[model samples]
Target: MSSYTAAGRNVLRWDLSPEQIKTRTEQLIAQTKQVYDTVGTIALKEVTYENCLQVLADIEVTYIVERTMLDFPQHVSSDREVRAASTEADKKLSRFDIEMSMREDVFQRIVHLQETCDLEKIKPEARRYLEKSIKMGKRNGLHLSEHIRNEIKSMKKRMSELCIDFNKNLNEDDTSLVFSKAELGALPDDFIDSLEKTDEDKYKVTLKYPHYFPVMKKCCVPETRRKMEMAFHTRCKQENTAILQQLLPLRAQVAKLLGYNTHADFVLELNTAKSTSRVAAFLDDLSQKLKPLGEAEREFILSLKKKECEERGFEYDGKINAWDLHYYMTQTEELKYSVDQESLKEYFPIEVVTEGLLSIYQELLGLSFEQVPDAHVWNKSVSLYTVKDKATGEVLGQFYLDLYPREGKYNHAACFGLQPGCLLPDGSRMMSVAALVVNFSQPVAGRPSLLRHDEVETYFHEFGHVMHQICAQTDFARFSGTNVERDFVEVPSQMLENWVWDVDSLRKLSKHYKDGHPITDELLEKLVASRLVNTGLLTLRQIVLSKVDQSLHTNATLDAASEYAKYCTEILGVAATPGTNMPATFGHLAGGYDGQYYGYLWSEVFSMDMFHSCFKKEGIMNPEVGMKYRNLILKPGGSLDGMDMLQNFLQREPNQKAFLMSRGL
Candidate 1:
């Protein structure tokens, strides 16, 4: 029997019921306690990798999958009770996880092993893991007195619970708006057809990405766009704001208790930015550079808004509202670049994009993908794919594509690393398992779900995360892919987005839904040319979001919505609508990205450089360079420092030239 035959080795348990999820969680929690007790009590003289590090590492990987079984269903489960169970399991696991982290016995054993072991002779990743474990153990307040330690631990457990609640509200919010046909003016017929018909001949639009985005971008009626944006910004406000209000100060209080000035200080010390001052300076410098360019973009979009209002006999505001940003930006591209996003969707049906994307990635990265037959999944729409080395036919990893939106699924496109790839004690390679959860339009009768051009780019972006996770060749679970510095984690995926902009890559990634023809060169040229049309404006917007997080963490004084509005008006050249709790829906601040939203732009600088200097400067499909990246960057995961990995790949220190040029600055 092959090592891959075991589902636990190569596959994740997806067929979990509510009770099974809780049962498995309880079992794993108890097993972990047993491990901590056994290993943490090892005598100093007997300390070794097998007796300690390997045991911890083995359980670490299993803990990931086991806890994922408990925690992940809250984001994807269709049943209410299942989600609740998952939520409860998450808190139980979190509290226990904190307890283990703070265990003096375990912390002392790790430090004892590190001090005694011949650190140079061991595997580098293992040594690094030991170093990190000791460092993190201390950071978790192991060095503090019992009274102070208890205070920090209590706050941590409560903070974890509150953060979960914040996201739970966002996930469970089912706010839908009803609009008359006239109100949804100029929105495509396909979009209209997808909506639910109301008793009064109106249509009901769920505030999902598939429904909300199209209305915001294409609907010509300004009032309709305003209402949709209002509903969107206000989503989960009532619940999430309360959660955030308490959670924000809890984070600040925890950071202070842990011997830091602010939450940002605590979070950034381990990240690439290293400090709030550095992040602020970086953002401010970029904001200054882009302000001149961003204002120019503002004038162009504002002119379009003004002309539209004049034609429709409506009053023209002197400034751009948040609602007008997407609609006018779309109009700008269509008018100036001759690129129509709606019509461009014809070349990008979901299946075709998946096929074409796989073909390009396989060729570019020297890997192979085979879809699992009758795969076990939470939803029927999900399909598992096993990745293998193209040359050796050896299993590399596996991932699931949970591609369409349904009730209670994660609202955004992201790659969830379900299982960490690592070497087991028995010399078996436990393949990584990741899931790409995204919300795209569902296919209707006689018509496949077509993707807008941006959605195609999103597919490439998220799939890159899956590749980065699965392609890792690490010995320790702690250093596996996507476990790098928070600011550096997004670089690989961000660079992969360059594929969608390349003509050769785009040609390979698209086919017309009706005729199976590749995109026309005329349309392709316009689409590529439009890539930089609003680069400055978009970059400014990212700066705005990132800054708000930094402001919240460092300052921690302003109201969430008021703080967001201040940054939006000043930086993006767009006035936030009054009385909207926009940040409540910003899931990043809730927990996943609390002090690190700046990472998106921080990582993008390196990604832009890597793409421009390597992928584009060498050939777009250059296998020599591509395989070098795969081996040097993607495969190492976080086993090496992020900068060292980039330097090894590029043979030089990375610079911001590529980033600036990409932004057309």
Candidate 2:
């Protein structure tokens, strides 16, 4: 039976119950084992694509969908018990995955099929599926002896548990800084009002981005920024630092067990770049190129800080701390581009931006979005939207928008596809389900939440992932959208960031929250003009963070905090606070981007390549080009090679020239 029938009845509900989770987890695991055990012991002569590969895809659809239902609550659930239960679900399934990978009986059967089956006679997806399964088997130690591989599987399970604990520490951290109104220093009344007040009426700021960043960028006083920076940098340090220590060696040993030199080496085998030396070369070369640029940018920011202190009649320190970086960045934009990031917020009230963004995507990509009221959601702030083809009115899929922050929510912006869009055995399509989680300020009494200019870009970028998931037509959940090579999947989402920068799209998506007026042409040009402010320095920070991750995962004995500090000082020219530990809460290392964090810059090159070649030359809202992009790029998803996807869309190979030009390099 199809997963639509097999697992459909127990799916799609988010209200958590310990009993339900327990029972459902048992049921799903039982079914998965029943199918997998039968396949594991099948006779060699009985092996065929239908009984082997197709059955695995069918098994994965339900296992993936149901396991996500049990495992996703830890990131979003408010209830502590539910979150704990979800963590258990994750650890349990992680072990299950490892155990399945070590099934020598199944591996031998698959190898038998590999030797006998004529792979050229099957569907390309099926062929790739069978081939990748064989590779995955070898990668997981199928070629090794059982006595040796058993220890590797045991270590791998603990590795999964450590990663989960690291994230749990961050997601559950509730550390807050108390500040008086004066201490908060020039932040808007609306922002100050949204904060919770304490016994003597002091405002309490959580480490969540909404509360933390306003103080970092706009709160004027260096003292206040210093406290905020320390708090942000040191989150989850006590427990997570210890957790990371144990996790790193397991990662190192896991790679050695798999016959690779390092964790980064193990990771890149399946990535587009495909080697540690290539990643190191890319980052090192980019660092040299950006060294001069970032140094110049740092000098400019320091000069602006010096000028601002003179204008305001304060003392000059002759050095920029991490806390002062964003404030002076605001000063630079105001002086050079006539842009005030705080003042530009009113034209981007969340409601108006949401509706206008929907309208633009609907027209550009020939799709429509309809809000579903009273939908089943995990929280009150969550809303659901159904997607459809505008011309034919054919339903595509649905996604949830969980856009505000809470006590235990995932702090950063991400798109999680709990259920993939794939085909059923009856030649019908299963409904795609995805969610966009971000941390924006919540609307207070009488004041609608206003988005900063950069936030507008974040919303557009994340929603592009939702579109990619629902628009895909893959036959197997294994190759779904957003499930491609770790380094290549961000291209579609990153490319969409260009629309937020374009004047026509900006005018369409923005309006003053009070007066109902669109942004002035004067303000519009300045906002777009300020797009590259300190981008070189920003790129340097990204490269430095990537280097920190690679070194920690690759080196035999590395000091995590010192490595972070060294990279920050060496590359970014900024001093990391001596004891403040950013590695403690840098979630990307734990969230599966360990060795491949260079993907952000790596993907943006193609993002810009596709945008400049298509939208810039054709038109920003040109549907002919948009449809080509939707079909050629997004629709195919992970089914094609990443370079093949780019070549098919661009009609040529991709390059970094457009990306450098876009960054004003």
Candidate 3:
């Protein structure tokens, strides 16, 4: 099953079992160490593009090798031992990268080459890579005193270890809420039946999204919703909280040692949002615009609660709790618009929706997808597809689709980039390979898996990343697909989410699970109309979380729980109920997102602008526009400035007009 046996073949071998992880990982690490030694020891005079820049790019071979070997075990393997081993390997590799970046000799050689070589001789992409490489070394404290550099290195190592531990804590959280049928009122019968039953005929629900989100939105019992919400928000409590406390100061210290005021300042040096002030300003402006709308939405929710309280012969409190928001939102939709998300699921069987997705991509991009049935993959359910240009038979890229939930798999929806596309020394292109991992409901009881509309949107968003990888024609790995500024990377994916809101697009993609009948125009219209039902509350909630994240990294003195409570009440107009440590489960802070959590909204402004200005008039599925996007946005990867790419496509500066309209502001 190993694909490492021959040259010019894919180097990933997805069939390794849990026991094989350690052996393969050690071998790959040893190989990567050799690359580190050679790259770090090369002579200064020989620092031509071949030995310097190309050698730096060649190191990606080892990176992807190590990454591929560890990714499956870390994220998907059900074996506890495998996950532990992979976590260790990940930390070891992180330390190696930090040490390499701190290498004074390598940094000096790069600087020397930059000063000695003629700027006109280097390719534009290579020059960008070179400049970024130099900046990278400096940002990692390569130019600092040895003591300070060692301190930075130690802090980075600790951060790496803590981040892994934080994620592992959440992933392994087995907190489950057990409820009787009487307690689980009004949930879908099929969904209720699908739950694991106890000996006493009770139902056991875990904090997985597929279960947790539905229960919060559908289950009628207030106590059941409260219990689920409390368990979810407070997951991995004291452990992750302590980890965040230790982790935040380390990030602040690194930023200070690197001569930046805060971690946000340090991180934004390379991101599109150039400073902490700018990001804060952007969030504040967005909050100002969204406050009135959010307050009105809160009043509506209270009105519904008032009606329910009167009908049930209870006192009206005029309050909306965190647990009550989703339930009431769903209820209000059903009451007002006659749309039930669960009922609509029957029209979105996974197979039918997937075909519609493929058809859209194929027509728009002039590409075709063919299943690679014999391709070796990690799990039997995993699917491999090769994308080829329909007009010229040229291979574009490949992707692996893993679409069901299982124990120990990554619990969220994401696309993992396995290989990056770039030009090789021999003038041929190295194709990118990515994996689209998601946890939708699994098929059971003689019925195929059906997707909720939101899940369909999730599929499109991740595949947007896949298309970014597939269409990239960059010359360097540093700026490869999806590696642009963190704030800008989500633009394409968010833009793709708009298609699911299109009526014609939904009809084209959906079919009833039993009869294979497409959705009617009435239902589609209702679905689209309800798309922004809770836009204000949802958006303000995101802004509050983003503010909390920014505050934690920028103001290391801030208490995590207190800041979360303060923002919830002050910015979002929702009180943070007691006994819920929401920051404990805020995984973005522990993961790489940190201060960049606001990128979701920051990128949406550009994404909405692109969609409304370009596609709204012509067509959502216009092939000409799609080709233009592929060529200008996706194909260049990060070779061009992100703003330049946006300007070229829009023919003007991007603004918030479309974003405001999309949000009903």
TM-score for every candidate vs. truth? Answer: 0.89, 0.87, 0.90
User: What is the number of residue pairs that collide in model 1?
Assistant: 0
C-alpha lDDT of residue 70 in model 2: 93
Cα displacement (Å) at residue 77, model 3: 6.2
lDDT of each: 0.86, 0.84, 0.84
Query: What tens-digit string does per-residue lDDT give for candidate 1 at 46-65?
Result: 88878888888888877876
lDDT of 1: 0.86
Q: Which clashing pairs does model 2 show?
A: none
The TM-score that candidate 2 achieves is: 0.87
lDDT of 3 by residue, 158-265 (tens): 998999899999989998988999888879798899899999879999998889999999887788988999999989899998998898889888889999999889
Rank order (by lDDT, best first): 1, 2, 3
Clashes of each: 0, 0, 0
The lDDT leader among the candidates is 1
Q: Alpha-carbon error at 332 in model 1, in Å?
A: 1.3
Question: Which ranges of candidate 3 are over 4 A from the true structure?
Answer: 1-11, 17-24, 43-46, 62-70, 73-91, 164-215, 218-242, 406-408
- Predicted candidate 3: what Cα RMSD to the true structure? 3.7
Give Cα distance to truth, residue 613, candidate 1, Å: 0.6
lDDT of 1 at 437: 88
